[PDB]
Design a protein around this ligand. Structure first.
Ligand code: FES
Ligand SMILES: [Fe+3]
Ligand SMILES: [S]
Length: 104
């Protein structure tokens, strides 16, 4: 199940895009350089949107507590985060960014 995100050219490096899913929590797609990554958009430490946070390199900083995760692995990058984010495969076909609707 692949969800159409947007045209690669529509995402500037260092930006984030929220992607809604049917019957599930939304995802966040991050563009690091020319690479694209995706994780659950919701922080595992609280009800917070990571796409509303700060992407520093390939680490997304949560809007709260100073928490952070690596967007490639979904692993916590800073306290108080301890639970890894689910990661989702991203693929670019003909300039269009697609994200898997199912975790990997
Ligand atoms: S809600 Fe995100 S680190 Fe606490
Ligand atoms: Fe905002
Ligand atoms: S935003």
């Amino acid at each position: 199940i692949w969800l159409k995100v947007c045209a690669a050219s529509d995402m500037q490096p260092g930006t984030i895009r929220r992607v809604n899913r049917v019957g599930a929590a939304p995802l966040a797609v991050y563009r690091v350089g020319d690479q694209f990554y995706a994780t659950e958009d919701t922080c595992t430490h609280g009800i917070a949107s990571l796409s509303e946070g700060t992407l520093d390199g390939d680490v997304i900083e949560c809007p709260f507590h100073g928490g952070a995760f690596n967007v490639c692995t979904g692993m916590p990058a800073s306290s108080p985060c301890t639970v890894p984010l689910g990661v989702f495969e991203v693929e670019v076909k003909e300039g269009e960014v697609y994200v898997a609707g199912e975790k990997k």
